[PDB]
Amino acid sequence: PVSPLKHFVLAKKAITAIFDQLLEFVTEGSHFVEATYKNPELDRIATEDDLVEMQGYKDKLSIIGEVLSRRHMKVAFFGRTSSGKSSVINAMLWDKVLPSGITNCFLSVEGTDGDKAYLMTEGSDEKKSVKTVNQLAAGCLVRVFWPKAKCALLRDDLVLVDSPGTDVTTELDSWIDKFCLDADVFVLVANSESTLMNTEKHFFHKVNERLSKPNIFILNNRWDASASEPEYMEDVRRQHMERCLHFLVEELKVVNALEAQNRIFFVSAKEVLSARKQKALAEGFHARLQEFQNFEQIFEECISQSAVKTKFEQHTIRAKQILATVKNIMDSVNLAAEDPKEIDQLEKIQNNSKLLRNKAVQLENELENFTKQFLPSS
């Protein structure tokens, strides 16, 4: 009953809280080495180089929690002009969010605290509404915003991108790519009374070399066209399996033949659409429908865990590094300290350093906790 995207907003609130108090930590630790380096009555208890890398660390830890709030999972859709890339998004999002059919641009779909329908373009803040300016308009991205409370997906900061047809424009395939570099999961919406083309395989081959380990789903859409005929169907689908096991396992070599069954699906969004807008019968629809609704799950299961690694792995790593360095500086300071009655001057830069020791110890352990938490494994 719970949407595997919970993983993601949970890991989110974790790291941000982490880097919130990480900033606070390095903030406080920065002034210690500052006031104490400046102290005219001290020889060399805290070098200026100690201050400089502390000035450095929080300078940029401010940045991290910032981009750690701008945060998002992204799945991108590709296929012939209308294999129903139109409709699949439209299906997962329980509404007609965006037209079936068309012209050439990327169409991303986010999740707003605002309550009404939305749309913004490249290169500034103007805001014109939804299907208002859809017919309107070296790549081109215009990004559709629908409201928070319409979809569990857009709540749990998933966003969906529709591409123009891989059918109708080459220009090479790489403003193609600097739109997709964000993405965690790439979906191939195939069109099933037809056959898996080469002008669609062109793309993922690049992406395979573009980006390492890309996680790729094949949605053989419009599975109604072959219905009413029980294993006229299964005949069609296994050779369809043949083209897709073909692709994922052996040319792309995405990932082996077993787990490739969890990547190839035979559904039609148009059915899943209607049954999801009916919330105020062709033979084997509830089969097709639940076929969609375990594509749902393993997608969410996949694009969930995946995205947390690919964009926290080394914010997390760098943090322990940053933490690692400040221990040594807190060492350095407590150390030159002990080397009058400004006896208890450094017996007042004694323990502050020990506090700042344990200040770090504080945050080591939590980062370790975050890693068994969301980064399997250890």
Helix H, strand E, coil C: the string for 149-162 is HHCHHHHCCEEEEE
User: DSSP class of residue 139?
Assistant: -
CA–centroid distance for 127 within its chain: 25
Instruction: Confirm whether residue 268 is marked as ligand binding.
Output: yes
Q: Tell me how far apart the alpha carbons of residues 189 and 207 are, in angstroms, rounded to a whole number.
A: 16
Instruction: Confirm whether residue 44 is marked as ligand binding.
Output: no
Instruction: Confirm whether residue 87 is marked as ligand binding.
Output: yes
The CA-atom distances, in angstroms, between 355 and each of 51, 132, 333, 348, 362 are 18, 59, 12, 11, 10
Instruction: Confirm whether residue 222 is marked as ligand binding.
Output: yes
- Cβ(317)–Cβ(41) below 8 Å: no
Instruction: Confirm whether residue 116 is marked as ligand binding.
Output: no
Helix (H) or strand (E) holding 287: helix 285-310
Show Cβ contacts of residue 42 under 8 Å, excluding neighbours closer than 6 positions.
36, 345, 346
Q: Tell me how far apart the alpha carbons of residues 77 and 310 are, in angstroms, rounded to a whole number.
A: 20
Q: Tell me how far apart the alpha carbons of residues 269 and 267 are, in angstroms, rounded to a whole number.
A: 6
Specify the resolution in Å.
Answer: 4.1
Q: Which residues of 240-273 are buried (b: 16+ CB within 10 A; e: fewer)?
A: bbebbbebbbeebebbeeeebebbbbbbbbbbbb
Phi, psi of 186 (to 5 degrees): -110, 125
- Tell me how far apart the terminal alpha carbons of the chain are, to the nearest angstrom: 28
The side-by-side arrangement of strands in the sheet containing 185-191 is 118-120, 141-147, 106-112, 158-162, 73-78, 185-191, 215-221, 264-266
Instruction: Confirm whether residue 94 is marked as ligand binding.
Output: no
Instruction: Confirm whether residue 69 is marked as ligand binding.
Output: no
Q: Is the dihedral of CA 323, 328, 333, 338 positive or negative?
A: positive
Show Cβ contacts of residue 262 under 8 Å, excluding neighbours closer than 6 positions.
298
- Cβ(46)–Cβ(36) below 8 Å: yes
Q: Tell me how far apart the alpha carbons of residues 196 and 198 are, in angstroms, rounded to a whole number.
A: 7
Decide the pairing of beta strands 185-191 and 106-112: unpaired
Provide the residue ranges of all domains of the chain, joining segments of one domain with +. 5-71+312-378, 72-311
